[model samples]
Target: VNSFSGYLKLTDNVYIKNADIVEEAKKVKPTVVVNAANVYLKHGGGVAGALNKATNNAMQVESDDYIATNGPLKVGGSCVLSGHNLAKHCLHVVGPNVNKGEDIQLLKSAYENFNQHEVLLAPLLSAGIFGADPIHSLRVCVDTVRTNVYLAVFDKNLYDKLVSSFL
Candidate 1:
């Protein structure tokens, strides 16, 4: 199936969109872009890899610098990143790895760490290689998201499922 786009207004400000997350990030001019990151902040695969590629690999360098200076992120923890081409700022958050026996609360914590930004470019954390249920993952984002946010669902089937279930 083809990829699609749609929106659901949770409130006057908080909204969710089913779109290509990386593509949307390139245009939204968001205050920050959210990376569904690992503890080491390695932008090697999944959303991390895609966003890193979109930034022309600047993400990995900044993320490495952050880890070098501050240390690795723990699950549920986050750190601010900069010097990327896509946006002025990036929020790297470590969600629970369900395959590793971590639970939903860690994922919830990851979303909760989002600071007050006007616009946020986000992804379906814990739903990819981390192996959390996609619908459940999406709900956590919906519950905690404030301000303007895009829950970029890159997979066409997932995009369809989320918009259908949420709308």
Candidate 2:
């Protein structure tokens, strides 16, 4: 059900949104939407693909340019790109693989450097194809968030769990 739209206050500044990240990015126009990417920043599928299509492949083009200039993004590392159509900018980051013991620190590292923005949009890193548990990924996302964050959660089970946790 894509109609999920809800909010919860975790701290004075940190909060969560049970909504679609790309859709919210289009509406709220956050400074940056944290994009899930591989080392090459390819927007082939999942959240990245959704964002790629939403921005008319601007995310992929800019990401390619960024990689051409800099290099492949290292796991736990991040870089910024012009959002083009959604948010003002996009922060591309790589989450560690689950086969490598599901390293929390590496996943945490992806978010360590994002406090500079006032409004941050993100998803549960590594929780998708990477195989990290959704709750674990959610914990890391919440723990490391440094500003007002809108967490775009999609799954009904996960959304219910997230809301139930607060209650």
Candidate 3:
């Protein structure tokens, strides 16, 4: 599973598709990429929501290697604490709640810090405040920014599931 195309360059040889934290960490891959979004408080639903969306997109792309962050990005879990719920081989860092400028900074930092080839996915609406239109936020972020970044936005229900799947 580790040699699969979907596996990140920094991941270990043993890949666990949809296992719990403890079970996934046993592989000890170099990098573990997570798909995160927002939950409540509108915006992008939260980190979990982003992850759920990313996971769904990955499946559509026929990628069977990524994992979910459970909820928003955080530190400590059952196994390796990569600052998130689903990251066992690598670290998945979700920025704190943000607004317009803050969201841009977070997205930029996320992309700049990680490898260019790494398949980093997040919820486009995660940047806006509660009650803010996610699609609007996404458009603003994508249109204004000029970096080589990519993302996938799922339906509202899927976004909600991502945020609360592990909660």
Candidate 4:
């Protein structure tokens, strides 16, 4: 039978069902991971919420990077990050408008870490734009980190902004 609301598929050892995508993903081991670029603490909640949905917290380690509130480690309560994949550290960087030139400095630091081949990951949308003109924000961030292995995942509008900024 066919259903529009949702359906379950079963074959041999592979089961494809229209249940919860996140739950299904967790059932199977994932080699590469991609997550939402933007997270609203009010709507979808926070990382803590997402984590609660998938697996038990017993296996996860929770600790702050302790980079200081107004230092390179934090911008408006967000942390700037580098070397995320190394499992040694996770940096949380706030977006461009949160701390102005401090964001540039953090980007430079992330670039240096990337140059060293560290596993780095960041939210391009949240880290690049926050207030005023998006293009300008993109320009500032790309200019600061273009020399390294940083990868940014942006929406269509953001992509346009980045392209315009580059040009």
Error of 2 at 129 (Å): 1.7
User: What TM-score would every model get versus the actual structure?
Assistant: 0.87, 0.87, 0.31, 0.37
Mind giving the per-residue lDDT tens digits that candidate 1 earns over 46-143? Answer: 99998899888888887788889888889998888782776678888899988888867887788887746667778878988989988888788777
Per-candidate local distance difference test? 0.77, 0.76, 0.33, 0.31
Give one digit per residue, the lDDT tens place, for model 2 in 49-165. 889999888778888888899989888888888888887788887898675554667988877756667777788788777778777776776678777676777676787787677
Which parts of model 4 have CA positions greater than 4 angstroms off?
Answer: 1-61, 64-89, 95-119, 125-129
Q: Score candidate 2 by TM-score against the native.
A: 0.87
lDDT of 3 by residue, 1-167 (tens): 23222222111211112222222322333245433322221213344434334344432222222233343332111111332333333234343344423443444344333343243233343333323455444444444434332333335463444334311
Show model 3 residue runs off by greater than 4 Å.
1-31, 35-45, 49-90, 99-103, 120-125, 128-150, 156-167
Candidate 4 lDDT tens digits, 40-143 = 21113233234223433321222222323232323323332321232223333333344234353343433232233222333332332333244444444354
Question: What is the lDDT ranking, best to worst?
Answer: 1, 2, 3, 4
Q: Count of backbone clashes for each model?
A: 0, 0, 18, 5
